[PDB]
Design a protein around this ligand. Structure first.
Ligand code: FES
Ligand SMILES: [K+]
Ligand SMILES: [Mg+2]
Ligand SMILES: [Mg+2]
Ligand SMILES: [Mg+2]
Ligand SMILES: [Mg+2]
Ligand SMILES: [Mg+2]
Ligand SMILES: [Mg+2]
Ligand SMILES: [Mg+2]
Ligand SMILES: [Mg+2]
Ligand SMILES: [Mg+2]
Ligand SMILES: [Mg+2]
Lengths: 96, 99, 48, 85, 137, 128, 72, 122
RNA sequence: AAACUCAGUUGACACAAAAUAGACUACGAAAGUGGCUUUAACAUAUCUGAACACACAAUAGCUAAGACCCAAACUGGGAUUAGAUACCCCACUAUGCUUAGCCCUAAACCUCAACAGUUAAUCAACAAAACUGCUCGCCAGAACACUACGAGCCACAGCUUAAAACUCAAA
C-alpha cells in the first residue's frame, strides 16, 4: 500500500517507571542503618508508604526487616538509633 | 464513542481526525448548505463558543443569513409559535460551528 | 556451574580441623552490614 | 528497658519552653501517638474500629479527589477574556 | 554550629553544659498528669528524690485537683522545694494527657527552675491490657 | 522414605556428581534439604516404578502418583498436627480427587489402573 | 512510525536542543528531524547497526554544524 | 537448608568469647550442621537492656554463623541456645541470600477504581 | 460519695494482649487470619454436584483441669431515687486465655449460587451496568410459624427439618 500508514509497535517515547529508592537492592534486618532511615527519630514509628515513597513490596520488606531487627536485638524499638540520625533524610516528613 | 469511525488514530494520547472522511463529509455538508441557500432557505448558525461568537455573527451578517451564538433560551425552536408568533418561519437549516 | 562453585566454596568452610583458627580470625575481623540510601537511590557506605 | 531521654525528647532552644512543648506536641500528633493514647482510653470494638477505618479511608480519598478537582478547575477562574460575548 | 532539638547522646563528647554539668547529670522532673490529678516528683540524676508535690498535697480536693491552676500550684511548690535543695536546671519528663500537663510545667517554671529538655513518656501499650468499655450516657 | 544421602532430583543427572567431595555430597543430599525435595524424589521413584513413560507429567498416571505423594505428606503432617483442620480438609479433598482420578483411569485403561493400585498400594473401593 | 524509535533515542541522548519548534511553519524541520533524515539516509547507504548508525549520524551532524549537546 | 544464626553473646574477654563461639559451633556440628562462615559484627551496646539467665546486659557481641543444617536439627539448636549461659540471645533464620531478589519494574501508577457506580445521573 | 493507705521515681517481672507499618487489600473453602523465628503446609487445570454423606464453622454456651494482667455479664457496695432498677463510680465472679472434648447458632451479608461467555442492540424502581448458556439448591398471598407434632443430634429452657385448623383482602 503506502509506507506512510502508521505501523503497529509499542511506545518508544515511554519513560521508565519511577523506581523506588530501594528497588533492586537487598533489604536485610542486619542493616540497622537502612531500617532506621525509615523510622521516626522521636517515636520509632514505622513510616507509611505515603511518607517513605516506597512501593508495596519494598514497604513490606522494610516493615518485616524492622520487626525482625527489633525483636532480635539489632534495632531500638521506641526510638531511632542516635548514631543514625545523621543519615540522609529520605522520608517526606517535616516536624518543624 | 460515536466519533470512533471518523478518528484516523491516536498520536501520543491525542486523537487525530481522519481528513479523508472529513473531506467527503465536508463536501456533502457544503453541497447541502449551498442547495438550501439556493432554495432561499433560512440558515441559522449556532455556536456557544464565546471566543468565536463575534466572528460567527459577522459571517452570518455578511452572508445574508442568521446567527444565534448567545444563550439559547428554552424553547426557541419547539415553542417558536409562542415566543415569536404563530406565523413565524423556522430555519430551514441549522449549522453548528460548535455542537 | 552451581555445583562447581559449591566445590570451590566448601574449601573455605569451617571444620573441626580449622575451628580455632577460623574462630580467632573472626574475632579479630569485623563485618559491617550497615549502609544508607540517598534520595537519588545511591548507596552510601560507612567509614571504618 | 530502653535508654531514657532519647525517645520523645525535645531540647529547649534559648529557654522558649512553650515553643519546645508545642514542637513536641506537634511531633506526637504527626506520629499519631496522641490518637493512640486517646483512643486506648476506652476499648473500641473491632466492628466499630473497622467501620471507622473504612470511613476514614473513604473520607481521605474523597477529600483528595475534591481537592484535585478544585485545583484542576482553578485555572479556569481567570478573568473573562470574551466579555460581551 | 546550630541548635539541635535532639538531646545530646550519653557517653558522647558533647560540649553543651548547664551550670557546669552534663545532660546526664541534670536532675529529672517527672510529671504524671492523670485525668483528675497532677503529681510532680523531682529526682536527682541518680534517682534520688528531692521534691514531691501534687494537687492533693497542695490542699485542692476532688474536681479542684483536676484543674490547671492546681497543677500550676503544685509545680510552684515542687519548684520551691527543689530550689531549697539546690536544683536550678531540670529535664522535664511528662506522662499522661491530663489538663495540667502543660500548666504544671508553667508552675515548675515560675518557681525559678529552668527546663532544659521536655520529654514525653506517656504509657502507650502497643497492645496490652484491654481497656475498660466505653461509657454510655 | 528415600535415604537421606540421596541426591536431589535437580542434581542426579549432573555429570561428575559422584566424584565430588563428601561435604559437597551431603550439601546436595536430601538430608540438607526440606521435605519438598523428599516428596519429589518419592514421586520420581514411583513414576519410574509404575508408569510406562516417566517423561509424561500430564498423563493421568503422573497426576495420580503426585496426588498420592501429596496424600502421604498430608497424612504424615496430620500424624503430628491432629488439630490442623485445614490440612485435614486438604487430605480429604485430595483423597476424593484421587478416587475420582482412579475411577477415570479404571474406566479408560484397566491394566495401567491395576499397576497403579499395586504400586501405590491403593485399594479401590466403590462408593456406597 | 519507524522514525519514532530514532526520535526517542535522539531525545534521550540530547533532549530538545536550542532550536525551538516553529510549529506554524508547515515545512519546519527540527534538529531531531534532521537527525532522523541523516539516520535514514545512512541506513539506506548500507549500515545496519543501531549504535553505529546513531554515532555516525551524530558525527555527521556535528560536521554539518549541528550543536548536538549530549546530556549523558 | 541454609540458616543464618544471629548470636548476641555476653560481653567478655577474648578467651571467654572464643570459648563460647567454639562451644556454639561445636554444638551446631554435633547436631549435624556444616558451618559455612563465622562473621563478627562486633561488640556494641544493645538497643535495650536484655536480661538473660538472671543477669541484665547492656552491651554484647554480635556474631553471625552461616551454616547448612537439616531442618529437624534447627529446633534442637535453639534449645541449646536457650541453655548457654554466655548467650544473651540467639536467633536462627532462613538465610537471606537464599531468597531471590525478584525484579521490581517500579511503582506502577494504578489509579482509583473506575466504574464503581452506574451511569444514570445522580 | 464509696474504698486504698497508698502514691511517685528506679529495678526485677506473664500461660494476657499483639502500637506504628496498614493511606496496604494480601492469605484461606467459609468462619476467619495484622508481634518474631523455625518446621510442616496452602486439593484438582478440564465444569456442575448434598434433607443424601464426609469435614469445617465467629461470638456466646456447656464439661473437666489449669493460668490471673486487664476486661467483664451476675452480684455486692457507692451515689441517685419516695423506694427500686438502668446509666455513672468502686470491688469482684462466670467468661474472654491454655489443654481435651462438646454445642453447630449469626445482619455466618459483596444481603447479588457455581462454571463459561458477551458488551451487541441498556434498563420497572433502588442497589453493585445489562445479559446469554448450563447446572445444583430454593420459592408459590399474608399471618399462624426461627411454632406444634414426628424424626435426628454428646444436644435436655437446645439445634436442624417443618405443618395444620381458625382468620384476613391484603401483606
Ligand atoms: S519501585 Fe521497584 S520494588 Fe518498588
Ligand atoms: K504489635
Ligand atoms: Mg465440585
Ligand atoms: Mg453444601
Ligand atoms: Mg463454633
Ligand atoms: Mg469458650
Ligand atoms: Mg478489673
Ligand atoms: Mg462476616
Ligand atoms: Mg453451588
Ligand atoms: Mg434461631
Ligand atoms: Mg424449634
Ligand atoms: Mg419435638
Amino acid at each position: 500500500s503506502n509506507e506512510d500508514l502508521p505501523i503497529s509497535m509499542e511506545n518508544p517515547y515511554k519513560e521508565p517507571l519511577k523506581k523506588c529508592i530501594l528497588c533492586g537492592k537487598h533489604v536485610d534486618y542486619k542493616n540497622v542503618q537502612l531500617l532506621s532511615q525509615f523510622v521516626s527519630p522521636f517515636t520509632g514509628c514505622i513510616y507509611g508508604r505515603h511518607i517513605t515513597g516506597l512501593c508495596g513490596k519494598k514497604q513490606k520488606e522494610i516493615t518485616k526487616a524492622i520487626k525482625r531487627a527489633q525483636i532480635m536485638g539489632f534495632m531500638p524499638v521506641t526510638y531511632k538509633d542516635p548514631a543514625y540520625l545523621k543519615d540522609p533524610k529520605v522520608c517526606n516528613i517535616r516536624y518543624r | 464513542r460515536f466519533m470512533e469511525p471518523y478518528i484516523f488514530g491516536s498520536r501520543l494520547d491525542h486523537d487525530i481526525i481522519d481528513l479523508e472522511q472529513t473531506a467527503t463529509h465536508l463536501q456533502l455538508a457544503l453541497n447541502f448548505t449551498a442547495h438550501m441557500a439556493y432554495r432561499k432557505g433560512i440558515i441559522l448558525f449556532i455556536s456557544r463558543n464565546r471566543q468565536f461568537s463575534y466572528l460567527i455573527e459577522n459571517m452570518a451578517r455578511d452572508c445574508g443569513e442568521y446567527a444565534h451564538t448567545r444563550y439559547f433560551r428554552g424553547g426557541m425552536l419547539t415553542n417558536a409559535r409562542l415566543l415569536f408568533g404563530p406565523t413565524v418561519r423556522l430555519p430551514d437549516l441549522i449549522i453548528f460551528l460548535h455542537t | 556451574r552451581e555445583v562447581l562453585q559449591l566445590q570451590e566454596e566448601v574449601k573455605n568452610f569451617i571444620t573441626r580441623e580449622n575451628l580455632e583458627a577460623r574462630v580467632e580470625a573472626a574475632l579479630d575481623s569485623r563485618k559491617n552490614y550497615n549502609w544508607a540510601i540517598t534520595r537519588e537511590g545511591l548507596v552510601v557506605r560507612p567509614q571504618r | 528497658k530502653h535508654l531514657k531521654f532519647i525517645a520523645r525528647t525535645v531540647m529547649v532552644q534559648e529557654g522558649n519552653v512553650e515553643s519546645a512543648y508545642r514542637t513536641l506536641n506537634r511531633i506526637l500528633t504527626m506520629d499519631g501517638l496522641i490518637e493512640d493514647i486517646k483512643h486506648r482510653r476506652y476499648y473500641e470494638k473491632p466492628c466499630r474500629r473497622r467501620q471507622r477505618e473504612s470511613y476514614e479511608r473513604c473520607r481521605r480519598i474523597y477529600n483528595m479527589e475534591m481537592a484535585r478537582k478544585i485545583n484542576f478547575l482553578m485555572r479556569k477562574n481567570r478573568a473573562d477574556p470574551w466579555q460581551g460575548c | 554550629t546550630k541548635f539541635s532539638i535532639y538531646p545530646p547522646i550519653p557517653g558522647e563528647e558533647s560540649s553543651l553544659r548547664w551550670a557546669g554539668k552534663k545532660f546526664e547529670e541534670i536532675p529529672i522532673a517527672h510529671i504524671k498528669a492523670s485525668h483528675n490529678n497532677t503529681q510532680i516528683q523531682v529526682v536527682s540524676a541518680s534517682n534520688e528524690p528531692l521534691a514531691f508535690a501534687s494537687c492533693g498535697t497542695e490542699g485542692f480536693r476532688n474536681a479542684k485537683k483536676g484543674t490547671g491552676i492546681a497543677a500550676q500550684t503544685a509545680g510552684i511548690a515542687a519548684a520551691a522545694r527543689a530550689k531549697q535543695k539546690g536544683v536550678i536546671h531540670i529535664r522535664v519528663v511528662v506522662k499522661g494527657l491530663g489538663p495540667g500537663r502543660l500548666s504544671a510545667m508553667h508552675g515548675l517554671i515560675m518557681g525559678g527552675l529552668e527546663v532544659i529538655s521536655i520529654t514525653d513518656n506517656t504509657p502507650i501499650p502497643h497492645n496490652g491490657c484491654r481497656p475498660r468499655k466505653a461509657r454510655k450516657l | 522414605d528415600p535415604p537421606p544421602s540421596t541426591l536431589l532430583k535437580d542434581y542426579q543427572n549432573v555429570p561428575g556428581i559422584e566424584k565430588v567431595d563428601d561435604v559437597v555430597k551431603r550439601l546436595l543430599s536430601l538430608e540438607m534439604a526440606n521435605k519438598k525435595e523428599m516428596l519429589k524424589i518419592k514421586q520420581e521413584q514411583f513414576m519410574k516404578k509404575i508408569v510406562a513413560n516417566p517423561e509424561d507429567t500430564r498423563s493421568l498416571e503422573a497426576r495420580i502418583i503426585a496426588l498420592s505423594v501429596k496424600i502421604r505428606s498430608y497424612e504424615e503432617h496430620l500424624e503430628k498436627h491432629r488439630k490442623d483442620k485445614a490440612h485435614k480438609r486438604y487430605l480429604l479433598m485430595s483423597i476424593d480427587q484421587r478416587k475420582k482420578m482412579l475411577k477415570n483411569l479404571r474406566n479408560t485403561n484397566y491394566d495401567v489402573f491395576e499397576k497403579i493400585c499395586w504400586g501405590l498400594g491403593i485399594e479401590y473401593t466403590f462408593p456406597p | 512510525y519507524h522514525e519514532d524509535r530514532i526520535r526517542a533515542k535522539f531525545y534521550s541522548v540530547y533532549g530538545s536542543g536550542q532550536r525551538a519548534f516553529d510549529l506554524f511553519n508547515p515545512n519546519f524541520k527540527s534538529t531531531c528531524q534532521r537527525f532522523v533524515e541523516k539516520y535514514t539516509e545512512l541506513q539506506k547507504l548500507g549500515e545496519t547497526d543501531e549504535e553505529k548508525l546513531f554515532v555516525e549520524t551524530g558525527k555527521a551532524l556535528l560536521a554539518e554544524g549541528v550543536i548536538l549537546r549530549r546530556v549523558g | 537448608p541454609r540458616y543464618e544464626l544471629a548470636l548476641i553473646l555476653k560481653a567478655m574477654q577474648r578467651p571467654e568469647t572464643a570459648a563460647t563461639l567454639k562451644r556454639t559451633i561445636e554444638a551446631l556440628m554435633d547436631r549435624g550442621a556444616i558451618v559455612r562462615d563465622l562473621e563478627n559484627l562486633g561488640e556494641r551496646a544493645l538497643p535495650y537492656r536484655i536480661s538473660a539467665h538472671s543477669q541484665q546486659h547492656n552491651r554484647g557481641g554480635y556474631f553471625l554463623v552461616d551454616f547448612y543444617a537439616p531442618t529437624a536439627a534447627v529446633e534442637s539448636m535453639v534449645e541449646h541456645l536457650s541453655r548457654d549461659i554466655d548467650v544473651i540471645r540467639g536467633n536462627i533464620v532462613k538465610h537471606p541470600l537464599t531468597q531471590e531478589l525478584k525484579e521490581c519494574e517500579g511503582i506502577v501508577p494504578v489509579p482509583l477504581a473506575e466504574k464503581l457506580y452506574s451511569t444514570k445521573k445522580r
